[PDB]
Amino acid sequence: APWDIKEEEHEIKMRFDMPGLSKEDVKISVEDNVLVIKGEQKKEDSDDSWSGRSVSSYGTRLQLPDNCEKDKIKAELKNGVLFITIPKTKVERKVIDVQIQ
Amino acid sequence: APWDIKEEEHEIKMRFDMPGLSKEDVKISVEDNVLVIKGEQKKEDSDDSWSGRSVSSYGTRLQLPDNCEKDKIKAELKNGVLFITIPKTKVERKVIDVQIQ
Amino acid sequence: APWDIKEEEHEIKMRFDMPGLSKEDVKISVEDNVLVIKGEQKKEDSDDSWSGRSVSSYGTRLQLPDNCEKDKIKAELKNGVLFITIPKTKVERKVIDVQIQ
Amino acid sequence: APWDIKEEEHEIKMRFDMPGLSKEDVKISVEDNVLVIKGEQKKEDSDDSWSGRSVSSYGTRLQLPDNCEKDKIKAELKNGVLFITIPKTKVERKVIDVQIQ
Amino acid sequence: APWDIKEEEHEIKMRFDMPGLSKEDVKISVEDNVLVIKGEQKKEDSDDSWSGRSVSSYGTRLQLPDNCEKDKIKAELKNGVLFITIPKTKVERKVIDVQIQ
Amino acid sequence: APWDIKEEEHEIKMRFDMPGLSKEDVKISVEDNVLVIKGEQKKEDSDDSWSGRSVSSYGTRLQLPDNCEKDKIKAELKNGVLFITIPKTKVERKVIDVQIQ
């Protein structure tokens, strides 16, 4: 299965995966509320000696409900699998319901 | 015809419809600018004694141009038909046009 | 789910549904063994002031196995939902089975 | 090719095209951050004397990243071709990167 | 609408259209009875500085019923719209009808 | 790109890839000339706490031209990527060509 993206019990979480890609070719970037991921192909630093070299596009968008709180943002890569944990927001301070009468 | 959603001559109006659903299983919820509707199936409180019991999903999104003014928001249900009337906003205080020269 | 039509434990039952349609625009008609339903659009008696006025065709056929016994035929409309209960018949007074030898 | 829409080396640019439409039937309109274009068919002011008169819908949306700065907004029409040049914004004053550890 | 081609009340008329193309890149050619149009892309004489440069094929055939009378043949280009007016012929000097008996 | 399978300049090589799968859930098996791969889902040994858990089938066939020489067979897993290197055979000791005359 390619990816997961969901509000967990307390936060927001993404998870994707990529063969070959090690701890080197990974980058991200933040904005006022926009996250972006940039993975690329460093499958040119050992040797080719091959045919089925894999090359594709990896960077991708994201927007958080509230402006992305930056400090506690965590992420990790293992066995060709990246995943990013990020804090939830504090929505629902006020609401009103039906008066259908 | 399932629904209508439109800016009338003075306000914003939604209208949808649902068999069975009476004045009980209806709920809404507001946000800073987000409306959401939650209807569900209380077709379990009289008796089944049936085969063609109808059950589906009814809640749905909405966003208003300007933050939803809450007081005068009205809505009503009759003959299995929901409809919500909500105040318009006061856009277009300034504009500029072509200077194609 | 649109409709149900079935032999229950003791009788025959139809059930359908229609938004808007109240206790006024409903009619039926019987025959020697043919039932027919005629619903129509009285969505012209309050006001239009609208775009998504719903108008369609509602009348529909039926035939009962035995000629429709007329007295105890019942029906009802609620929350835009029609349903007709009608007596079963007394088939299977005699039968013969295989003699495949 | 119908249109182009892109961030150039320094600004934002749209370009589209329309047969017949001259410097008369063109209009635009601005908002806090919303641009809209309104072209229409003045192919009724010379004469018809024709069959293949062209009539369609031309107005279209746009939103700029930052609220549309209004003064230096330029545009032009030639040979049935419209194009609008508009100032870029000043995003990316701060950023944070991975700490995948 | 792309083009029109028709016998008018007195003559024959074509009309087509092309963004960008001005009074320069247009050419035609005549034959004993064959007309041909050759438009091309001079969208290389101002500057590119662009992505959505439009380039396509424009030349096209035609045959007139009678050999094309050459003198009074007229044509014009405006707002990226070409159109050619050409004299009709003098067919139907004799006819015979049914004798189905 | 999913996989590569090819005769290299001197040997035979397979390469595939699998997210999540680490150095644990991997197995192979040999035969007289048949290779088979068995990967499975050990995504049950850390915790679920998730929705998009990935589970599928991974084992797959192979046959080598000549009976698989077993000693020098190598393979490796990194960044969720498996690949197996295996010795080539020594075909083409004799041949005959056309005599089409």
Next chain:
Amino acid sequence: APWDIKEEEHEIKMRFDMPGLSKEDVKISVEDNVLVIKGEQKKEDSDDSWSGRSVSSYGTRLQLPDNCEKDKIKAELKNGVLFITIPKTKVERKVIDVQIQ
């Protein structure tokens, strides 16, 4: 248009059509309530001397609501067009309507 079949103001009427078929190759047949038409190809009695001889199937079913009254049944063929006029029945001697309460 191939055919017409309808209850007129007072009776029941069919109309169809067939090239070539003259007053010879036409037949019908009645039943307790079933009508059937049998037209065939007598395009073998003058001469072939041809390629595009037309041959197809023409007979077709019908059932009348009440058993077909036989005497006044009329029909006619002209210009390769058949049409059958037949008496209506006397349905609706009794009816009952809604009691939806």
Next chain:
Amino acid sequence: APWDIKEEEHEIKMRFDMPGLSKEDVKISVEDNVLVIKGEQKKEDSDDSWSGRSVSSYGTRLQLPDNCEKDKIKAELKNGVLFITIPKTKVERKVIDVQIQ
């Protein structure tokens, strides 16, 4: 070929077929004019010890032109093949033909 259903030279005949089904799991049932067949799966009385156990639905409808004469109705099963022979009726005591004039 699955089945045959036809009026023979003197009667009416059905024939179908079913693997496994022996002389046990077969049943029929008659009505005023309705025949029905009920075969089922007794592939649970010897043992499973298997994977490709076959289970499906076998009962099926029939209506005879005239009310089914019951005595001489015959049927048989052999080599997983059922077939039912039933008496024809005595239709066509009277008829009327065209008067197309």
Next chain:
Amino acid sequence: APWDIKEEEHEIKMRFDMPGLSKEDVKISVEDNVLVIKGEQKKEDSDDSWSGRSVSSYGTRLQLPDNCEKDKIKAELKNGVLFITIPKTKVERKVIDVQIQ
């Protein structure tokens, strides 16, 4: 079958067909080498009193190899079937064959 168009053993022949159309609404027209047929709908001269009135387009083109010799051109309509017989031409006065060497 709709139509036939063919060179017979000695001439050229067309044949088509049209329900309703009698000996009245038929017309043709000749040219230097162009034949055209014009049938239309006179299904307005008796009465409508109907629903399935048939109306369509019937005129159609033709070109003969050599200019249409006019005198001996024959045609006829019967049972809603038109057919036109026309003289062949006298092609093939000279020819040359391969010299492939």
Next chain:
Amino acid sequence: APWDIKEEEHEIKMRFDMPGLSKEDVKISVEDNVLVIKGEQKKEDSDDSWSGRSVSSYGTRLQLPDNCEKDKIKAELKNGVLFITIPKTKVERKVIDVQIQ
């Protein structure tokens, strides 16, 4: 369900089925390792007197992993159902596993 083909707990088993076909029209044939089945249509030895006579092709291939041991091969036909039981082989006398290091 048409057929089953599988390695059971101890052997190899096929099972298929055929209406009509009795113990007569069945044949098989063996090879070094190839099995083939030949059923045909002896539905010509009793009488036709029918329309829905069934005729098709029944012979089919098979290959066993190891050369087919011939003695204990069993098979049977009942209720139009064929099935062949055949001995398994003795594979897996030696194996080697990963050394992914």
Next chain:
Amino acid sequence: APWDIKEEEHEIKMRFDMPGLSKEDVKISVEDNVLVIKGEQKKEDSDDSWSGRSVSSYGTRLQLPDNCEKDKIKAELKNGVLFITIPKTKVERKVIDVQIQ
């Protein structure tokens, strides 16, 4: 690739191909301006002793711009490949261009 048909630097050229067909079964025919090719199947003069005998249709049309000059027309067949070289014409003695003003 099946065929080529093109105006070369000085003439007109066709080229096609056909297995089996030798220098015998080839024919052409000329007209005032129409060329036609007739190849056929003489794959009946040696012996069949075969299954995959090839038989198809080979004759085909052509029209030249100007009436086909007959003398210098050349053609040849080799290795199951035919090709015809034919003289070009002398078009474009006069022309007129745009006056779009």
Next chain:
Amino acid sequence: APWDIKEEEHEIKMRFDMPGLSKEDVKISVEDNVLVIKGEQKKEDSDDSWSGRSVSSYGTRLQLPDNCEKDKIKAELKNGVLFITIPKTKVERKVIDVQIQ
């Protein structure tokens, strides 16, 4: 028709075909039991002077039941048609049949 491949009355035979390809660009190759054909495009040795030059892939596999006996293998090319005749094998020295009891 592209090819034929079949066991004749005494041997095995292939036949295919290729335009242009003469007695030069043809090659085959044998193995223990594998035949392979290699045709290629020598349509570069006379001249191009063309557009519709044909180039494709021609080599193809084959396996014989028994190891290919090499001496008497024959083949030939004529009129762009290849065909290979090869000796049959001597299968069926022993067999066993049903004992369905």
